[PDB]
């Protein structure tokens, strides 16, 4: 499989209610391993996965150092964008940043990213070539110049192509039991009569990891993408994910519908049918 390490940062200003809020979370694939919350008591990077709890005091020390470094950078960022967009100082604004790296099945660098948004819209982002920026508006363009002169892409390239993949790998081995485990989907189907001439057919895909999955309904082998309810893949809170696909079916016709399940955990895609 392909693996990823990602950092999610969220900064939200609170006009007259104190310092801006700063939340940071960090994931390895579909597992969250650490967090930082500007309102938490500790004021340090906390572990959110059992396999990072093993890290020594220096790691926590250094990640807590970096994490509030980021935090400060985001407390200043709220103010610059405000000036850039000529915004009142009365209203709350949101900044969002995301960076990380992807590795292939060989555990080798595949792609590196660094994205930034202001009030839910793309602000500035690092291209796949790690040498050029996508500025959205002129304000983003002033940021682009500034990051060009400070040679930030070069610095970020070394990070995503190196220390990122390097520590991703370490995490992978360190948490081998739950990071390198691929749980196939526990699948099952339900039949609910809606009226005397119709009935709901529900395909279930429970306790799987990773999150990726293809839950499809087909009638007479042809896909029913237009008339199927499909819920977004949701967390079960036990490290696994759940999902379902539902199709309303004319009673006496359950047998021509077939649910299809595609997941890394299965050697072969499942085809279930009501019967």
């Amino acid at each position: 499989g392909s693996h990823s390490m990602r950092y999610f940062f969220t900064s939200v200003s609170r006009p007259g209610r104190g310092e801006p809020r700063f939340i940071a979370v960090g994931y390895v694939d579909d597992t969250q391993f650490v967090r930082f919350d500007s309102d938490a008591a500790s004021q340090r990077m906390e572990p959110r996965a059992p396999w990072i709890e093993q890290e020594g005091p220096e790691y926590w020390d250094g990640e807590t150092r970096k994490v509030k470094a980021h935090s400060q950078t985001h407390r200043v960022d709220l103010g610059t964008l405000r000036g850039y967009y000529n915004q009142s100082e009365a209203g709350s604004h949101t900044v969002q940043r995301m960076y990380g790296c992807d590795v292939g099945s060989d555990w080798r660098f595949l792609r590196g990213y660094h994205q930034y948004a202001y009030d839910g819209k793309d602000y500035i982002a690092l291209k796949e070539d790690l040498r050029s920026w996508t500025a959205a508006d002129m304000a983003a363009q002033t940021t682009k110049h500034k990051w060009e002169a400070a040679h930030v892409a070069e610095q970020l390239r070394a990070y995503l192509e190196g220390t990122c993949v390097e520590w991703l790998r370490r995490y992978l081995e360190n948490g081998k039991e739950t990071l390198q485990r691929t749980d196939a989907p526990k699948t099952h189907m339900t039949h609910h009569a809606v009226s005397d001439h119709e009935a709901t057919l529900r395909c279930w895909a429970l306790s799987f990891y990773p999150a990726e999955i293809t839950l499809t309904w087909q009638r007479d082998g042809e896909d029913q993408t237009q008339d199927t309810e499909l819920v977004e893949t949701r967390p079960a809170g036990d490290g696994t994910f759940q999902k379902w696909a539902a199709v309303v079916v004319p009673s006496g016709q359950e047998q021509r519908y077939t649910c299809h399940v595609q997941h890394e955990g299965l050697p072969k895609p499942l085809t279930l049918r009501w019967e």
Partner: peptide
Amino acid sequence: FLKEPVHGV
């Protein structure tokens, strides 16, 4: 493992 340093906008 977080990245350092981080430049503002």
